[PDB]
Design a binder for this molecule. Sequence first.
Ligand SMILES: Nc1ncnc2c1ncn2[C@@H]1O[C@H](COP(=O)(O)OP(=O)(O)O)[C@@H](O)[C@H]1O
Lengths: 116, 115
Amino acid sequence: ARPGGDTIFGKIIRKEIPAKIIFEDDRCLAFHDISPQAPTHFLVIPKKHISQISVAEDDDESLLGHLMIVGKKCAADLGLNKGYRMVVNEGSDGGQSVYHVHLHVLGGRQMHWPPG
Amino acid sequence: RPGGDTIFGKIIRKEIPAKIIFEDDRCLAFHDISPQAPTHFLVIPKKHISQISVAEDDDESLLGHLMIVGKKCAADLGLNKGYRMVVNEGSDGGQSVYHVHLHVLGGRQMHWPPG
Ligand SMILES: Nc1ncnc2c1ncn2[C@@H]1O[C@H](COP(=O)(O)OP(=O)(O)O)[C@@H](O)[C@H]1O
């Protein structure tokens, strides 16, 4: 197991391929999504490879919460003052495509209900 | 006031009924009264945080706890094919109640975009 894991996100974490990075620290990375579904759409990912939220450990609590705090801070820095939606997809019914935990943050338009 | 002045505060205080799934010292999980999937529940902190935008760095572990409780409840609700977790902020996010809440939806295919 490489730092960052074996998915495409591991290449982003290891800087092998570029991404438009909003924030980085020793625990996580936030970057814009290349297939945006809203005028602003970014991802916050842990540097630790957790494949899916369903396999997260109890002591990954802090890390998961950090993703959300980083998300909210990045949303504010990106000017999302009218609101936004955070999404985590799990497995096939959740529409998860990349098996590395990631938090979507979408805003800049009205989001509708249901959320897919 | 502890747990707040929203309907979710009333639920936490047991003043009105809810379809409670799980409780601990710091959070409550209950089925959404307006479900959008065959399983649709909420995980909420007992601490009244109005919205994710005002959460503080010291709330990190509590927020993560909502996600871990959500995953554990999803498993005990039979959701083995997946699910979607959602936090709405503000008007554009479609936030319905100004008390932080994590939605967990599954039991059907969730689609893209997520609203
Ligand atoms: N190299 C990349 N840079 C930015 N976004 C990426 C890259 N590769 C994948 N993505 C995005 O990663 C996201 C993965 O989320 P998942 O929840 O796994 O799938 P989807 O949500 O597309 O059905 C998608 O929104 C996709 O565009």
